[PDB]
Amino acid sequence: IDEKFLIESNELVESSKIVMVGTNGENGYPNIKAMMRLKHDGLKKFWLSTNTSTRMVERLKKNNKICLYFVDDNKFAGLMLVGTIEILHDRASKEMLWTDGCEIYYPLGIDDPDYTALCFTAEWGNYYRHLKNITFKIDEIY
Amino acid sequence: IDEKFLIESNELVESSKIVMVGTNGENGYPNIKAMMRLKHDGLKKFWLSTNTSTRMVERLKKNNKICLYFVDDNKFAGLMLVGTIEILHDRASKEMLWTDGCEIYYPLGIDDPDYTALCFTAEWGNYYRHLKNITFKIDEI
Numbered sequence: 345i346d347e348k349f350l351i352e353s354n355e356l357v358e359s360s361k362i363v364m365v366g367t368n369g370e371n372g373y374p375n376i377k378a379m380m381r382l383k384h385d386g387l388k389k390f391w392l393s394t395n396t397s398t399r400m401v402e403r404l405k406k407n408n409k410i411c412l413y414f415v416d417d418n419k420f421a422g423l424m425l426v427g428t429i430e431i432l433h434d435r436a437s438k439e440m441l442w443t444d445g446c447e448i449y450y451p452l453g454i455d456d457p458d459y460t461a462l463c464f465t466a467e468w469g470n471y472y473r474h475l476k477n478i479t480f481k482i483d484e485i486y
Numbered sequence: 487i488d489e490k491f492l493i494e495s496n497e498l499v500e501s502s503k504i505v506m507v508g509t510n511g512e513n514g515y516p517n518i519k520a521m522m523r524l525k526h527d528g529l530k531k532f533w534l535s536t537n538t539s540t541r542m543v544e545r546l547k548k549n550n551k552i553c554l555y556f557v558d559d560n561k562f563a564g565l566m567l568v569g570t571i572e573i574l575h576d577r578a579s580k581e582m583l584w585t586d587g588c589e590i591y592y593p594l595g596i597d598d599p600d601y602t603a604l605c606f607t608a609e610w611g612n613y614y615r616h617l618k619n620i621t622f623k624i625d626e627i
């Protein structure tokens with residue numbers, strides 16, 4: 345509950361545009377994919393970008409329990425957040441979340457058929473560091 | 487399945503000291519944790535260490551289906567392996583897998599009570615590059 349974590353975890357989040365996203369894959373195996381962080385609100389909410397794959401979409405439709413992971417291997421520190429994700433289908437949201445260097449990935453702009461936007465809402469997390477971890481609920485850390 | 491994207495998969499694995507490990511967690515949620523690579527054999531077998539944790543031991547005994555993810559540090563790309571994991575509780579295995587480098591995390595050595603070794607066996611791979619992925623079965627390649 346010390347203020348350092350939220351600030352330290354926030355630096356961790358801010359330090360890369362890439363987030364590792366864990367999902368429930370086929371046949372009971374977890375799957376991890378890299379996604380792009382379009383926006384976040386502290387540790388409460390993340391808006392992410394990934395390529396439209398019917399596989400991923402169908403999977404998230406049936407099971408939206410996910411986790412996010414942020415790491416710096418140099419400190420051997422990481423942050424994991426656990427929560428649920430929803431696909432944002434409306435163009436309004438897609439437009440408001442669009443950023444520079446979305447363009448690198450989605451040449452046809454907001455209307456690129458491969459631009460999918462997601463909203464992750466964190467329930468809890470775990471900060472790992474010095475081979476220990478501190479688990480917290482989001483509603484506590486604020 | 488071609489040898490270009492599999493040469494990059496192996497290079498990525500050989501350069502990796504830390505690997506992201508995805509496990510099936512409480513209440514239906516995936517969980518991810520960084521673990522250290524001790525040894526591997528191609529893309530089929532990976533020996534990992536992490537700190538001893540009774541929560542993780544119980545998790546993995548209920549459900550040993552996991553994935554590994556190797557981040558490419560120089561471009562938007564990565565390798566995901568999927569398979570099953572087993573904890574190596576025996577000192578013989580821990581002695582064999584011990585590498586110079588472990589002394590940083592486990593200062594009491596092979597007998598450090600926080601030293602846990604695990605053996606992952608991959609069944610399927612997925613290589614991500616250029617916003618695409620190629621899926622392959624490890625035993626075919």
Ligand SMILES: [Cl-]
Nearest residue numbers: 434435436437
């Ligand atoms: Cl709206």
Ligand SMILES: [Cl-]
Nearest residue numbers: 585586587589
């Ligand atoms: Cl020595």
